[PDB]
């Protein structure tokens, strides 16, 4: 009873994840820097499907065009050698001091122009390497104080940036879509578009909404105390789940980025249940940090437990949905009735229906139990492999 | 130096606010029930502009059509006697046991039909009394466990309900718009459409989006640790701030509904600054609970401090924006540059602009301070009336 | 592979738990009131060991001494008929309006005297029924605003109340100990002694500290975002874990009181691991609310899943600690070294030890990985019954 | 109406505060390193009383004994030149990789011995420079996973470390006391002794409790959603407020360390009210980070606003307590009765007092309002300088 990943499971990892040297706000690095080509090789051996990158993970900031080409060639050789793909890429608009007040919504106009040029350069590279999704995380877009940022003007600037990027892609004829990744705070006191809902809403105001979706992250919605499976369900309902970041988080605090399955384990179960039953077919991407307590052996153990926990939860969610006793419980709780239209008969028929109001027996309806606790204990028993 | 409300300030109160008897999850009522006509008279004397109501606040659940007409006539006489208006109304789809699994997204279809009929009956009354906004708070729409609610099916049911309501209003030719009020949790373990962003996003999928906006509440966004002024700015940017609920909240915990100005006082300052500078012209509605420690004298004192604190903050925000020294600080922090287009010259010009990349001096730009702390201390000094 | 409780597992339930009628801040009761004798009989059939009570759960507030004796006689007959015990009792100092500003720390002196008399009356009854622990939950002790409560004076009043109760018990020669139950907020805006640490600290200032310990609750420490197993470890270290309340909670929000095992499932695992390895021998008490969605069938299903989840977690924690591979991992992570004294050789020897400073190789020590992620994945695999 | 600090106000600053270069988990430094002698001179000009330091702030890690003496001599000259004092010192047991699993509670014994030697070396220096308080912040003492740390063994190790430090000080005859600074999380997933209450409780188990108190920090208790003034009141009640860290925090999230007065402004008001009315006489120490958006002008502006906001709040709290109308309101709310003993007449008299139970009119007592909202609005009006 083991749980071995293959490239067909579509598991991906950012370079910055296994590559995190362990520098935190209070401490120095505990691990040496990893060569991207070493991470590609090590992740391939563990059964991953591919890797993702920020521009600056792959090509050191300020590299000359000759060093750039060299970094890319070595990387490309490692992909060729391993069969690893690059399904997603993104921009670092957060590390360099120039970005201390944001990239696309910096108060300084010149910075905002530079942010766009830096992004466009990396869209070209991403396309070259075969990425289908381009992620935007505006971790520096926000404020620590109320007068520093007019948020209406800042959303104008953010719309302008994303519209220019959509013009660029369509003008180049690229097959690439954008995914906005929300986070509510950290490193800014408050970040703009802080949740999946705020990002979904914003997208509907862009000039070409069909080019944009979301890249939600488990731990970021949980930093606002929100139900991650519920947020993903809304993104799926809107047709905007382009990509996803998988990890774990213990409640409302700094962004922990624990390996997937740590943190809120029942939420991880209901997330896998949803992705698998909705048939999500994008990458299963891990955005996690091996704790700085670990050496490189602990790094690869942590990355392997990401994949393992996904597969165990997949098996338990599938057993849950396949169990006849669960299917009967779902009927008992009227999940079947939730899926039926309230009033396919139309408004006028509803208005004329005395059984909907005038003659509706509200006490009899009130008295019916929902049988949710029995259903939830079956879900617990399935998760724990304790079906008796 | 006093701060007296008049009806022209557009201050409104729910019947359920000053009428809260003080029943909490752990204790009995501490105050007797108020007659709606007494609350109308007492609020008029304090300088309020109008009141709002749930159906069941005004007409006892299960009232006959004769008792109904009587309740409404007495109410209407009190409005006539005082000049009070009714700008907003809403439905109770949360108290009665029949609603224990939701109204519009209850698993039982019959309940969902009943929820719609109950709502439509009250839209007619609201129109009769002159309301312009109809609020929907789905406090029972959600779940305590993951298998109880398929959230894609539940959003289908929620869309269906709101589309039927928009069909009704347009068929009747009513001048009334809908406002969805988000809350992240309580009384359900997780509530659907938990934040302003999730509600804005959902609205874009309705058949007639122009009929729907949001009614955000200070304390509800703060129950997710979010920046309320930032959420309001996004609602204003989308053109969807139809109504607002004003109160206070101390951080992430149960819904406190303190009087406005209690809770996060700096957030209240930045909220008033925004509403006044954006020229919001709807009601300034208070959804608050006088603490159950209070007798009726404490009730009216609490309601009066709601209005007082709004007026004091209005004065301090106006003094802030009018101060030449603040105007200079805003320029120093490049708020003027945030309001200018990043690239009105267009994409091609941006791509050809060497000063945006090839020759952009990133260290010089990085070195410029934002001068945000000096700006924020001027804002503090203005709030505290300590300008030296 | 089933998990059947017997009275020997020491599982107990408050009357108020299965008896909760489902009244919440926003809704009416969904269930009829249960007779205490029915709950005793139903819990006995499920395998419970005993029940606990507030005074007012058992004897209706304001009962005459004749009704009192009658309520107690019927109760006592049900205990005799079932073999159920009563290991713990407590006082309701929170429901009645008189307690709206607290019991022991109400500003009104007369209320504080009444709170003490009401408590003492119930200590006598508790002793009569064989309780060994008397719990105090000061849910009304606190404030919504800063000037309402001088907290130094309020701690004086709280000390005075607990000292008088300790004088009473010792004067009567009773064998009963007190346990303070912390909660950080709700129903008061902030509650005094909000966490296990604050209660432990307070106890050290009482006249007879040996009479007092803590009754921590899973969901209450999690309402402050704290690690419940860590808080219990500190209570065990102090010798003050007199009693415990078991339930589940999804993060920082209102007090959910979900059945045990819901909420934070990994925390529940580490809690059971600790209680079992420290050999806690008190009651395993459930303070939970069957969700108001449920009818009485759902009530008893929820109570049975409390016990079931405890037993499953007990089995998985025991398998974890017994696994040789885990024992090797614990050594790899130097848990054995944590249990050894840092400096049993004494201060002077430490000062003279050059290998502790002058010649300590800090880079070699820094380079050693802690191997925590491999250990934590073994714990995950054990929890999920996925050991491969 | 200005608010100028002098050395007599006892305002102090850590070297690491104005010296923070702005490195965060996601970005590089935005400011150059400050010489400690420059910070001493600049803080003296702003009206500060003194500075505090970690060992490694003052003497670069790994410095030779000759460089050490040089660093100290230059520092000492700057103190002499300015009249600045050093009232507090502390140890860095968090930055160096060797401390990745803790200092005093690292699993590796050798690390724990090294942590103690490093600490003792700095106690000698602190004494030399005149510090009266030695702070311990165990930011690396904790865990990200449940099996990594046995918390009973870890509290044994923590007790052992603090007892050895108390033996050292008493053996040397030093006049220095210890203050433990709690924090609930960050950089560890959970930190041991996470709140003021947990630290107070732990202290009572040390061999010489009179040597130890707490150094609470505004933003750290707020990272658990707790009421900071209430926690300080308990520390004052226990006689353990040895030192305090002043700053601001917006709710439950990463540790922001905003300047004092930012964050929760009403909490800052009630804190100053308490410190001033209890007559706290230790340093008013600021542990804050000027946001990384700022240049050095913004650094000194931020440090000056710390002091300014303290003085403005001091004035408003003093005006509040001195107002006759407030004094009358406090009586109306029975704050005077809270300060009187509940039962100075003793237990037996209480038991015999029929007016305390048998003849206590609970409805009349319940009906009395507490008049807390009127009191709290007077406090608001005083804070805002809006007394009408
Ligand atoms: O978008 C790219 C990634 O950028 C940064 O590494 C963020 O911390 C991570 O959350 C995000 O996914
Ligand atoms: O929508 C109507 C109102 O309904 C209920 O009273 C809710 O608690 C309140 O938040 C909401 O504003
Ligand atoms: O102390 C007795 C019990 O009293 C109340 O029911 C509280 O809600 C519960 O937390 C507590 O355990
Ligand atoms: O104890 C010394 C100081 O050490 C570190 O700088 C901590 O971040 C700060 O909170 C603490 O006060
Ligand atoms: Mn993250
Ligand atoms: Mn991410
Ligand atoms: Mn509310
Ligand atoms: Mn509301
Ligand atoms: Mn509880
Ligand atoms: Mn409890
Ligand atoms: Mn801090
Ligand atoms: Mn500090």
Q: What is the DSSP string of B179-242?
A: EE---SSSSSSEESS-SHHHHHHHHTTSSSGGGEEE--BHHHHHTTT--HHHHHHHHHHTT-B-
Question: How far B332 CA sits from the closest chain A CA (Å)?
Answer: 10
The answer to whether the Cβ–Cβ distance between A250 and D190 falls below 8 Å is yes
| Alpha helices, H only, chain B | 15-18, 36-46, 55-58, 65-82, 109-129, 151-172, 196-203, 218-222, 228-237, 265-278, 296-322, 324-332, 335-338, 347-352, 362-367, 372-384
Counting atoms of ligand 2 from 1, which one is nearest the CA of B16?
6
Q: What residues in A contact D30, CB-CB < 8 Å? A: 97, 100
Closest CA to D257 of D343, D85, D137: D137
Contact C55, C121 (CB under 8 A): yes
Q: Is C279 exposed, middle or buried (0-12, 13-18, 19+ CB in 10 A)?
A: exposed
Closest CA to B291 of D229, D331, C56, C190: C190
How many angstroms separate the Cα of A384 from the Cα of each of A22, A315, B72, C272, D145? 33, 11, 57, 15, 19
Question: Which residue among A49, A55, A56, A57 is the active-site one?
Answer: A57
- Nearest chain A residue to C224, by CA: A252
> Is B80 known to sit in a ligand binding site?
no
What is the Cα–Cα distance from B279 to B299, expressed in whole angstroms? 30
Look-up of token digits 């009927």: A331
Q: Give the contacts of A22 (CB within 8 A, at least 6 positions apart).
A: A29, A30, A31, A289, A291, A292, D97, D100
What is the Cα–Cα distance from D366 to D369, expressed in whole angstroms? 8
Question: How far A47 CA sits from the closest chain B CA (Å)?
Answer: 30
- CB-based contact (8 Å) between C206 and chain D? no
What is the Cα–Cα distance from A59 to A331, expressed in whole angstroms? 55
- CB-based contact (8 Å) between A376 and chain D? no
- CB-based contact (8 Å) between D72 and chain C? no
The answer to whether the Cβ–Cβ distance between A100 and D22 falls below 8 Å is yes
* Rg (chain B; Cα; Å): 23
- Nearest chain B residue to C190, by CA: B250
What is the Cα–Cα distance from C261 to C268, expressed in whole angstroms? 6
- CB-based contact (8 Å) between B3 and chain C? no
Q: Which residues pair with B143 in a beta bridge?
A: B190
Torsion, CA C373, CA C379, CA C382, CA C388, rounded to 10: 20
What is the Cα–Cα distance from D184 to D217, expressed in whole angstroms? 11
Q: Give the contacts of D244 (CB within 8 A, at least 6 positions apart).
A: D215, D216, D217, D232, D275, D280, D282, D283, D284, D285
The answer to whether the Cβ–Cβ distance between D100 and A254 falls below 8 Å is no
Q: Which pairs count as long-range contacts for A115-120, CB under 8 Å and 24+ apart, including other chains? A: A115/A161, A116/A161, A116/A164, A116/A165, A116/B342, A116/B343, A116/B350, A116/B356, A117/B350, A117/B351, A117/B353, A117/B356, A117/B357, A117/B360, A118/A55, A118/A91, A118/A93, A118/B357, A119/A91, A119/A93, A119/A165, A120/A165, A120/A168, A120/B351
The answer to whether the Cβ–Cβ distance between D293 and A24 falls below 8 Å is no
Report residue B169: phi and psi, to 5°. Answer: -60, -40
- Nearest chain B residue to C102, by CA: B293
B54 classed as catalytic? yes
Torsion, CA A151, CA A155, CA A156, CA A160, rounded to 10: 150
Residues of the binding site of A for Mg(2+): 181, 217, 220, 245, 255, 257, 287
- CB-based contact (8 Å) between D144 and chain A? yes
Counting atoms of ligand 4 from 1, which one is nearest the CA of D220?
10
What is the Cα–Cα distance from A188 to D258, expressed in whole angstroms? 12
What is the Cα–Cα distance from C367 to C344, expressed in whole angstroms? 26
Domain residue limits, chain D: 1-388
- CATH number belonging to domain D1-388: 3.20.20.150
DSSP helix/strand/coil, B148? helix
Q: Give the contacts of D70 (CB within 8 A, at least 6 positions apart).
A: none
DSSP helix/strand/coil, C246? strand
- CB-based contact (8 Å) between D191 and chain C? no
- CB-based contact (8 Å) between C377 and chain A? yes
- Nearest chain A residue to D102, by CA: A293
Q: Is D387 exposed, middle or buried (0-12, 13-18, 19+ CB in 10 A)?
A: middle
CB-ligand 2 contact for B133 (6 Å cutoff): no
DSSP helix/strand/coil, C49? coil
What is the Cα–Cα distance from B15 to B59, expressed in whole angstroms? 12
Structure tokens at D12: 């102090």
Report DSSP state, residue D54. Answer: E
Hey, whose CA ends up nearest to atom 4 of ligand 4?
A: D137
CB-ligand 4 contact for D256 (6 Å cutoff): no
Residues 333-372 on D with a CB inside 8 Å of C are: 333-335, 337-343, 347, 350-351, 353, 355-357, 360, 362-363, 365-368, 370, 372
Closest CA to B384 of D279, D2, D258: D2
Q: Which residues pair with C133 in a beta bridge?
A: C88, C177
What is the Cα–Cα distance from D8 to D47, expressed in whole angstroms? 9
The answer to whether the Cβ–Cβ distance between B309 and D380 falls below 8 Å is yes
What is the Cα–Cα distance from B328 to B375, expressed in whole angstroms? 9
Look-up of token digits 């208070």: B286
Resolution in A: 1.6
Q: What residues in C contact A301, CB-CB < 8 Å? A: 373-374, 377
- Picking from D3, D372, D387, the nearest residue to B386 by CB comes out as D3
How many residues can be counted in chain A? 388
Contact B214, B199 (CB under 8 A): yes
The answer to whether the Cβ–Cβ distance between B291 and C95 falls below 8 Å is no
Structure tokens at A243: 């990509």
Question: Which residue among B49, B54, B285, B382 is the active-site one?
Answer: B54
């Amino acid at each position: 009873m083991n749980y071995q990943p293959t490239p067909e499971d579509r598991f991906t990892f950012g370079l910055w994840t296994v590559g995190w040297q362990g520098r935190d706000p209070f401490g120095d690095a505990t691990r040496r820097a990893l060569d991207p080509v070493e991470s590609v090789q090590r992740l391939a051996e563990l059964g991953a499907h591919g890797v993702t990158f920020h521009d600056d993970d792959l090509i050191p900031f300020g590299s000359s065009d000759s060093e750039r080409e060299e970094h890319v060639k070595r990387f490309r050789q490692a992909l060729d050698d391993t069969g690893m793909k690059v399904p997603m890429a993104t921009t670092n608009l957060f590390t360099h001091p120039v970005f201390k007040d944001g990239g696309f919504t910096a108060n300084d106009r010149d910075v905002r122009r530079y942010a766009l040029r830096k992004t466009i350069r990396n869209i070209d590279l991403a396309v070259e390497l075969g990425a289908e999704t381009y992620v935007a995380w505006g971790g520096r877009e926000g404020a620590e104080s109320g007068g520093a940022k007019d948020v209406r003007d800042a959303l104008d600037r953010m719309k302008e940036a994303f519209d220019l990027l959509g013009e660029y892609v369509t003008s180049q004829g690229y097959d690439i879509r954008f995914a906005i990744e929300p986070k509510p705070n950290e490193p800014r006191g408050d970040i703009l578009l802080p949740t999946v809902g705020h990002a979904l809403a914003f997208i509907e105001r862009l000039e070409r909404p069909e080019l944009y979706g979301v890249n939600p992250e488990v731990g970021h919605e949980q930093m606002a105390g929100l139900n991650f499976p519920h947020g993903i369900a809304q993104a799926l309902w809107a047709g905007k789940l382009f990509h996803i970041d998988l990890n774990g988080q213990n409640g409302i605090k700094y962004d922990q980025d624990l390996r997937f399955g740590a943190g809120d384990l029942r939420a991880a179960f209901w997330l896998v249940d949803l992705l698998e039953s909705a048939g999500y077919s994008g990458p299963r991407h891990f955005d996690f940090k091996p704790p700085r307590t670990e050496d490189f052996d602990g790094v690869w153990a942590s990355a392997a437990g990401c994949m393992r926990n996904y597969l165990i939860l997949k098996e338990r969610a599938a057993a849950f949905r396949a169990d006849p006793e669960v299917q009967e419980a779902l009927r008992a709780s009227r999940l079947d009735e939730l899926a039926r239209p309230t009033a396919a008969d139309g408004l006028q028929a509803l208005l004329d229906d005395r059984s909907a109001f005038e003659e509706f027996d509200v006490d009899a309806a009130a008295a019916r139990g929902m049988a949710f606790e029995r259903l939830d204990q079956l879900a617990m028993d399935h998760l724990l492999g304790a079906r008796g």
